[PDB]
Structure 1
């Protein structure tokens, strides 16, 4: 059974522990390892870390050469308007693969990395909402294990771990608190949530053994609140486009979280810099929820017509439309996995985050007509959405 495998995989190897490793850096950080620089949140994390630290940022990247790796990283940041050529000296591509033993490094390379790196931001992961647990085991479970291995190899390296609110159970009335313990593995639906649950369990055990860690759980990470930068292969963009093209949207009961990526990246970096954050968990979600009917109002205001249907009737219309439209069919696959009220969605409390960030000026943008206009304007500009009539 999958929960058997999850429980077995959540046991952290005995040798991953402080042992005789040298103490963590207490002075200025010289070097930082970032995983996930070729992803969405990763692009913003990388640019932010360059702005807010003086460290060389080692970036794990799958590539045949270091130049190819640098090219992947540059193009990714370029796609979000985050690149400037002055960043290149700050970036050290590290050829490797989060889904491989030792992050894809030879024993010698791994040992060297274990000597050079002062701190780790682990944002690398395989995110696939269709695949089973076993498809993401290598990248999410073993990859996190190997990061924990690096963090305890040679000398201790603080770990700022990017998890997800999806490690939390659905169907709760009251907003889940940042300090509530994790439930059992059967509380989760889908391979992604399952793999991230196991990953966070490993990280929490390394914490219990003395590794300094921060656990950051982002909610639904949306577009940049000013530029509108947003990868269009995102399921949220997929869904919005589907509704626009069909001219109909669902009424759902769920409180909707939309958390702009610039808030998530700034909060991760801010929190990672606070010694008070060690051993702590933070919910990087929008403190202000929005209702679906409000979302559709904002989208109509931008200029898109949207009839509203009960979720089950909406899903039925999607099913019908999928007959002749393979893109709508693709969207349907995501939604047919698990009624009237629509899908359950996790609601989080973020009290500890709000407090920890109070003197920072790091604050989550509101979801309002203006934010949605910024988002839709960018999607139209980039050819993803047809401009409103």
Structure 2
């Protein structure tokens, strides 16, 4: 198997990630001469459907396949196909009867679940099944990743970089398949701000990257590696690619009991509500300064990835799925909205004093809350954040495409509002965390 050592073995280079380190010579020689998959999509392969974004993508693609009597195939980690299907059923059994009925209605005719693993040869599938996917899949939608902001690139390489290369083997066999990929705004950690754009080739703007133990270094490197591999594949055979670099993915209001419990935003809301104390400001003071939180609700993101993804046109397109507005809606407003919805929060004016008292209050929480709180991430809040008026990244290509496709209720990128924050509270209560 390809490994971090065989490919990269303190700094890594985009040039390290040639497809010949992952895929056999014959597959690569043949890829330029293969036909494209049919542009009328009737079979979709979705990874990560048990994940937070992935389950919303599963709903999108079940709905889209219902219109054309098609099939959604979900790759799910499990010891058997039976267990895999049970895991995905359980994902949609969250205390919302309408969600469960909607999923069950669509899944009966349009869902296949396969046990497998992106990091394994042939995605962990037997040769007959793998060949069937190679022959039939019209689109790959790939949000699956090990999302962990502490592990090194050496440990995330398997699921996130090699995993991309394994899906590319499938995309480059029998017929060339469009590939929709989720990356992260975090790749910008090592890129000059003026060069970090939707138009750029990631190999040009991020040719060399450092490997170290800083926050999310490994994860952001691993997501960069996927983008680089996709660029290599596009050079070889022109496969359509859509890369969606996402900001923080927020919970959304349609379905009850659907939260990304381990993510840092959920941990923050739970921690504020449970301790009842917030800082005067989460941001550097001037007075409290105008600030913007760069997050988008998941139903919007799933719809945009689906509508604007690689099946929708030819070429290689990168989109910054970010919230660009200078709207003054930041973390301090979220505290105010928590307070206004019956989750009382007292402000401690001095940030340092707040942080010390907050740590003490977190340790006093009962186990279930404490384990899902900000306690393990407090190190990241040692200094207040510098406020930004909009996003750190440009969004012109994404915003134009969202407007042109008339996506969502705003026919535009949405703003965050109080109902999003209130949904965190009502879901945390439903899940027994408040």
Contact 1:127 1:192 in 2 (8 A): yes
* Structure 2 residue corresponding to 1:204, chosen from 231, 252, 255: 231
| CA shift in 2, pair 1:130/1:318, >3 Å | farther
1:25 aligned counterpart, secondary structure: coil
Query: 2:426 aligned to 365, 377, 389, which one?
Result: 377
1:6·1:198 contact (CA, 8 Å) conserved in 2? no
- Does 2:20 match 1:13? yes
Q: Is the 8 A contact 1:225 1:365 kept in 2?
A: no
Are 1:293 and 2:300 counterparts? no
Residue-by-residue CA offset, 1:256-281 (whole Å, 9 max, x unaligned) = 12210000000001102664463011
What residue in structure 2 maps to residue 88 of structure 1? 108
Q: Which runs of 5 or more residues in structure 1 are unaligned?
A: none
1:350 to 392, 395, 402: 395
Report deviation, 1:235: 2.1
Quick check: 1:175–1:349 contact (8 Å CA) kept in 2? no
- Provide the TM-score with structure 1 as the length reference: 0.87
Shift in Å at residue 342 of structure 1?
Answer: 3.0
Q: Would you say how many aligned residue pairs link Structure 1 and Structure 2? A: 385
| Correspondence for 1:29 | 41
The yes-or-no answer on 1:76 pairing with 2:91 is: yes
Contact persistence 1:18–1:156 (CA under 8 A) = no
- Describe the SS at the equivalent of 2:151: coil
Match of 2:247 in 1: 219
Normalised TM-score (structure 2): 0.79
Distance 1:78 1:9, change over 3 A: farther
Deviation at 1:167, TM superposition (A): 1.5
- Are 1:155 and 2:175 counterparts? yes
Off by >6 Å, runs of 4+ in structure 1:
170-175, 343-346
Task: String of CA shifts for 1:174-221, please: whole Å, max 9, x gaps.
Answer: 795322444332398422112111121111221222221111112100
In structure 2, list runs of 5 or more residues that go unmatched: 1-7, 284-290
Q: 1:307 maps to which residue?
A: 347
8 Å contact kept, 2:275–2:362 = no
Return 106-115 or 218-227, whichever deviates more: 106-115
Q: Give me the whole-angstrom Cα distance separating, in 2, the residues matched to 1:323 and 1:279.
A: 48
Which whole-Å deviations, capped at 9, do the CAs of 1:74-109 have from their partners, x for residues lacking one?
211233725223323211112211221221123443
Q: Deviations over 1:300-343 (max 9, x none)?
A: 11122131455544433343345544654762322426953338
Match of 1:279 in 2: 316
SS in 2 for 1:103: helix
- Render the CA deviation track for 1:143-197: whole Å, top value 9, x for unaligned: 0110111100122111111112121227977795322444332398422112111
Question: In the alignment, is residue 270 of structure 1 matched against residue 277 of structure 2?
Answer: no
Kept in 2: contact 1:178–1:283 (CA 8 A): yes
RMSD: 3.0
- For 1:277 and 1:57, locate their aligned partners in 2 and report how far apart those are by CA, in whole Å: 22
Q: Which residue of 2 aligns with 1:242?
A: 271
